[PDB]
Amino acid sequence: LDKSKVINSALELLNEVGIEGLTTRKLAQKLGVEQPTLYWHVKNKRALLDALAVEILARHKDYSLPAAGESWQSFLRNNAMSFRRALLRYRDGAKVHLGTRPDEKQYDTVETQLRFMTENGFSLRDGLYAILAVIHFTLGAVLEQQEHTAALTDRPNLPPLLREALQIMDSDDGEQAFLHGLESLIRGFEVQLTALL
Amino acid sequence: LDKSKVINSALELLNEVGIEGLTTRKLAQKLGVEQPTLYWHVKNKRALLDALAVEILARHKDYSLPAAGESWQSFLRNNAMSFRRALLRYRDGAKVHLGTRPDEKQYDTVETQLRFMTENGFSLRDGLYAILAVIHFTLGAVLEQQEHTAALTDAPDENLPPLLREALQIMDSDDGEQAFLHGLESLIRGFEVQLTALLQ
């Protein structure tokens, strides 16, 4: 009857109806309380969504900080893949994350990641841009995957390249395509960092 | 009614009520026709969104094919920039695009795009993965842009640590375009290194 139990109902509802159907009204029903009483703990849908994003990563993003000795390349790769896996746990998990900014509970992690970059030859700006590029790529890759599978519920002799392309994409959940683009980002950051020197 | 009529009012309604608010019931109302009349044009919201996605690129994605003698680098950069502009045109445009596949009317262009990549020494697979990476990154950047601004009215926390404070300062300084162009160019430089790694 608090803030934490809103969150655990709201995760269940999200999986059931998705982000669109996750309303203040519907969550109150599922909890069996009035709408203003959810407010004491989860103000509105934005605050609720913000809380859900944080909880999803807290539970299911099991890599955030570099290990002793770890390259920034490896740090970026593991962070991106872990974030992807976490977004994929819940339905519309990536939609939930869109437009959120770091929460008070994540500040020390995020700061350590930013510091790490600056310690590995990046300017704060460039270290940040690299991280945001990895985050944006992961968000779009997952949101495309998540939405395409959803859309097959409703949607019903090809050119040789496109036919081959489609077979390649349908081979898995997008993972190999993801890992390729992720490495390309990393390889590009490396070139840029070497360039500057 | 006919196709352009349905499409023009759908796009207008998208700007009015956004993707969540958009319903075939409200489009029929707006068009002044009964439900089954529209049904035979758009069977549901998923069909409507598909039709909108295609139309938005048809009208506002001004670049798709490379000029004679244009580099693959430039081709990728130009497709992304143009894709982003088309997505920025209408409310929730990046959300409308999500999940779709190329339409039969886009097949000829896509095949030409894939072949061009193979003509520059990409395997079909790696050319595909390059194009998808640029698309995905562009969607995510745009969606993050369209969504953070959206939630603006829903004071900077005094407990913000310094790199994070400054980082958030850096991000707000513009509409996301600087970060987007840096990310796009990182992708392109990485494709280059990879293509060179193999083609050596």
Ligand SMILES: Cc1c2c(c(O)c3c(O)cccc13)C(=O)[C@]1(O)C(=O)C(C(N)=O)=C(O)C[C@@H]1C2
């Ligand atoms: C480093 C940084 C990240 C994120 C940001 O939003 C940032 C931002 O808005 C400004 C400056 C830096 C940011 C994330 O959203 C992120 O997904 C995140 O929060 C967590 C995490 N909580 O573990 C990550 O591990 C990766 C990402 C790091």
Ligand SMILES: Cc1c2c(c(O)c3c(O)cccc13)C(=O)[C@]1(O)C(=O)C(C(N)=O)=C(O)C[C@@H]1C2
């Ligand atoms: C090659 C390919 C593209 C796209 C896809 O969605 C694909 C997909 O979902 C599966 C397999 C291949 C895809 C696009 O969305 C894209 O933005 C597009 O359609 C157009 C375009 N219409 O001009 C492009 O110019 C580039 C992109 C090509």
Ligand SMILES: [Mg+2]
């Ligand atoms: Mg984020």
Ligand SMILES: [Mg+2]
């Ligand atoms: Mg697409």
